[PDB]
Design an enzyme around this catalytic site. Structure first.
Site, short mmCIF file in Angstrom:
data_model
loop_
_atom_site.label_atom_id
_atom_site.label_comp_id
_atom_site.label_asym_id
_atom_site.label_seq_id
_atom_site.Cartn_x
_atom_site.Cartn_y
_atom_site.Cartn_z
N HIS A 18 39.76 44.70 39.43
CA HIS A 18 38.80 43.80 38.89
C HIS A 18 37.50 44.53 38.56
O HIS A 18 37.22 45.57 39.10
CB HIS A 18 38.51 42.66 39.86
CG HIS A 18 37.77 43.10 41.07
ND1 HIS A 18 38.42 43.60 42.16
CD2 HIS A 18 36.45 43.13 41.35
CE1 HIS A 18 37.53 43.91 43.10
NE2 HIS A 18 36.30 43.65 42.61
N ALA A 20 33.27 43.29 36.69
CA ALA A 20 32.31 42.21 36.43
C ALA A 20 33.00 41.02 35.74
O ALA A 20 32.81 39.89 36.19
CB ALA A 20 31.16 42.72 35.61
N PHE A 21 33.80 41.25 34.68
CA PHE A 21 34.17 40.14 33.78
C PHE A 21 35.67 39.84 33.78
O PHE A 21 36.08 38.92 33.11
CB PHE A 21 33.65 40.43 32.37
CG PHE A 21 32.16 40.62 32.31
CD1 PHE A 21 31.29 39.58 32.63
CD2 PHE A 21 31.61 41.87 32.00
CE1 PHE A 21 29.91 39.77 32.63
CE2 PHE A 21 30.24 42.05 32.02
CZ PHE A 21 29.39 41.01 32.33
N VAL A 23 39.77 40.13 36.00
CA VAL A 23 40.69 40.48 37.07
C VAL A 23 42.05 40.80 36.46
O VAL A 23 42.39 40.31 35.39
CB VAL A 23 40.80 39.36 38.12
CG1 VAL A 23 39.49 39.07 38.81
CG2 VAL A 23 41.29 38.07 37.51
N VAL A 24 42.79 41.65 37.14
CA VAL A 24 44.09 42.14 36.70
C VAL A 24 45.09 41.90 37.83
O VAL A 24 44.84 42.25 38.96
CB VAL A 24 44.05 43.62 36.31
CG1 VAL A 24 45.41 44.10 35.80
CG2 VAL A 24 42.97 43.89 35.29
N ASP A 132 33.78 55.01 29.94
CA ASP A 132 33.82 54.73 31.35
C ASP A 132 35.11 55.27 31.99
O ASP A 132 35.63 54.64 32.89
CB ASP A 132 33.70 53.23 31.59
CG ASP A 132 33.51 52.85 33.05
OD1 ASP A 132 32.86 53.63 33.78
OD2 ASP A 132 34.04 51.76 33.44
O1 1FV Z 1 42.09 47.63 34.09
C1 1FV Z 1 41.20 47.81 34.92
N1 1FV Z 1 41.27 48.78 35.83
C2 1FV Z 1 42.42 49.66 35.96
C3 1FV Z 1 43.29 49.26 37.13
C4 1FV Z 1 43.80 47.84 37.03
N2 1FV Z 1 44.67 47.66 35.87
C5 1FV Z 1 45.91 48.17 35.81
N3 1FV Z 1 46.50 48.56 36.94
C6 1FV Z 1 47.77 48.95 36.87
N4 1FV Z 1 48.38 49.13 38.06
C7 1FV Z 1 47.87 49.29 39.35
C8 1FV Z 1 46.56 49.68 39.53
C9 1FV Z 1 46.05 49.83 40.80
C10 1FV Z 1 46.84 49.59 41.90
C11 1FV Z 1 48.17 49.23 41.75
C12 1FV Z 1 48.99 48.80 42.95
N5 1FV Z 1 49.75 49.89 43.57
C13 1FV Z 1 50.95 50.21 42.77
C14 1FV Z 1 51.68 51.41 43.34
O2 1FV Z 1 51.46 51.53 44.74
C15 1FV Z 1 51.41 50.25 45.34
C16 1FV Z 1 50.16 49.51 44.93
C17 1FV Z 1 48.69 49.13 40.46
N6 1FV Z 1 48.51 49.04 35.75
C18 1FV Z 1 47.88 48.67 34.63
C19 1FV Z 1 46.57 48.23 34.58
C20 1FV Z 1 45.83 48.00 33.28
C21 1FV Z 1 45.72 46.63 32.69
C22 1FV Z 1 46.54 47.65 32.01
C23 1FV Z 1 39.95 46.97 34.95
C24 1FV Z 1 39.74 46.08 36.16
C25 1FV Z 1 39.20 45.00 35.21
C26 1FV Z 1 39.87 45.74 34.07
#
Ligand code: 1FV
Ligand code: 1FV
Ligand code: CL
Ligand code: CL
Lengths: 276, 276
Positions: A18, A20-21, A23-24, A132
């Site tokens: 997540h 400011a604007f 959540v994922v 960023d």
């Molecule tokens: O996109 C963002 N930050 C990047 C991390 C969150 N988004 C994602 N995370 C992920 N996966 C993810 C990110 C952080 C933690 C995890 C969970 N782990 C997976 C492997 O080990 C277990 C936990 C998985 N995949 C894709 C995406 C983006 C939308 C296309 C911002 C947060 C507001 C937008």
């Protein structure tokens, strides 16, 4: 309790990041349930109070379609929220990978950097800067969870919320008519932040190598002023660092943009061109 | 044959301007028919092939609500097109006014410039730059068509299609989390084009005074290269020009942004602060 988003679904419990604007959530296709997705929910009212435009990330993600950039599969608009259904990275972020590994070998850094550079080549060719980049939005994807070593990792750049377009030369003439009243710096496409991502990448590589970022600070305040006051900075490179990686790091980590390595120099830096 | 756009209407015959992605018609409220409006029609498919975002102008016009900036009254979305219903300027553009008058007195220039500066103060406070100011989008409005002299003209800036937002210091920290990986020029809000409009205004004032723009060129090509090659330019100021207006013009018409007068200096320039 699963929320529904077009042909996909997610639990509100499965928060994976997540800001400011937004959540994922980790979610999935409702029928092809082993097709995992990342579902980004943006509050419309919160967003309209920032300078951020709602459709910017959508348009960028469509224009940047590429194996080292998270894909966009669907957009679902509701009265309060927009949902982006994007590629899920089952490996999490580089930040967590670094916490678990401590520091990376130069060989590993080279493999990751090759992929980051590929992403940067597509951004560069569309005149997009991310602005960023950080370990929290440089993500890891494993195609088979069996192939769990370095050679099974595909890097994917995410979160274009703070990104911007740079116009080209006639990108100014071709839409804005006669340029006779136009500022020279606008006609000539001069951009102070054109190399922002290269600094970022520098900080990230440095952290992979050394185990900490090159310039820490207790807050955003400290870091701003430290950069304000010190108009020239030398990052501390370990003596054991290979000469060419050190050269690359010092080129990226130039405090002053005009002295910073440019994209073509980065893409063709001898550290990046290797075999195994 | 009148086209209908919400509570307003227009004839396709009543074209009052156009560019690459838009046409603008004189129209009116369908019942309050002496309420004239300017209706901008944007083709969606043509626009998505540029870097221009669809909602940018809409959002800017709402945030810039002010007497020297055209108002936005309504937005109407169709499958192919978006319509913006905006304030109609019944005096046309500065370009036509100049063609009819030849050159303006310094007193007239001062009155127009006071209004342009007021517009610029609101842009400045929201961190917006226009980037394509010219006589064709600096418009004239007469509240009574009886009061047809200089003192009846209200100036209104239009066409924010090429405009952009500049972030402030914490506008970077407040939404993008820890700035530890962020480029110094992004953290510090350093912007090459922050004074683009000031150059433009310079060219426009110069043309009001002298009867031609300060640097003509047969094409966009010539003007780009002329500005590329000559890294320092002196505009030709007539000897009869008042000392303070000449000072203002030379401050605005600095080829190099870093040497150019900044907004606060422009807003408080002694030429602008006067009585009658
Ligand atoms: O996109 C963002 N930050 C990047 C991390 C969150 N988004 C994602 N995370 C992920 N996966 C993810 C990110 C952080 C933690 C995890 C969970 N782990 C997976 C492997 O080990 C277990 C936990 C998985 N995949 C894709 C995406 C983006 C939308 C296309 C911002 C947060 C507001 C937008
Ligand atoms: O907005 C643009 N250019 C500025 C001139 C056209 N737009 C406007 N023109 C006007 N009026 C106008 C402009 C040029 C000519 C005329 C017609 N004359 C009126 C007085 O004398 C008779 C003819 C009127 N008012 C407002 C507007 C803008 C939308 C809010 C761009 C063209 C694609 C967008
Ligand atoms: Cl942009
Ligand atoms: Cl913008």
């Amino acid at each position: 309790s699963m929320e529904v988003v077009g042909d996909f679904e997610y639990s509100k419990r499965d928060l994976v990041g997540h800001g400011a604007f937004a959540v994922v959530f980790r979610g999935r296709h409702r029928q092809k349930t082993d097709w995992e997705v990342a579902i980004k929910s943006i509050n419309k009212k919160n967003l309209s109070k920032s300078q951020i435009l709602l459709g910017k990330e959508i348009k960028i993600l469509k224009e940047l379609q590429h194996e080292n950039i998270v894909a966009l599969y669907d957009v679902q608009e509701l009265p309060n929220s927009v949902f982006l259904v994007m590629e899920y990275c089952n490996g999490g972020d580089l930040a967590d990978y670094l916490q678990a590994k401590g520091t990376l070998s130069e060989d590993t850094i080279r493999v990751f950097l090759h992929q980051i550079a590929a992403a940067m080549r597509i951004l560069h060719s569309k005149g997009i800067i991310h602005r960023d980049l950080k370990p929290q939005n440089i993500l890891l994807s494993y195609a088979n969870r069996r192939k769990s070593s370095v050679s099974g990792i595909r890097i994917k750049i995410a979160d274009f919320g703070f990104a911007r377009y740079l116009h080209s030369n006639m990108m100014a003439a071709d839409l804005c008519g006669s340029p006779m009243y136009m500022a020279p710096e606008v006609i000539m496409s001069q951009h102070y932040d054109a190399k922002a991502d290269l600094w970022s990448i520098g900080t990230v590589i440095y952290q992979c190598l050394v185990g900490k970022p090159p310039f820490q600070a207790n807050s955003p305040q400290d870091l701003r002023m430290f950069y304000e006051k010190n108009r020239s900075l030398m990052p501390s490179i370990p003596r054991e660092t290979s000469p060419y990686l050190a050269n690359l790091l010092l080129g990226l980590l130039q405090r002053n943009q005009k002295d910073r390595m440019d994209f073509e120099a980065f893409f063709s830096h001898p550290f990046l061109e290797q075999g195994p």
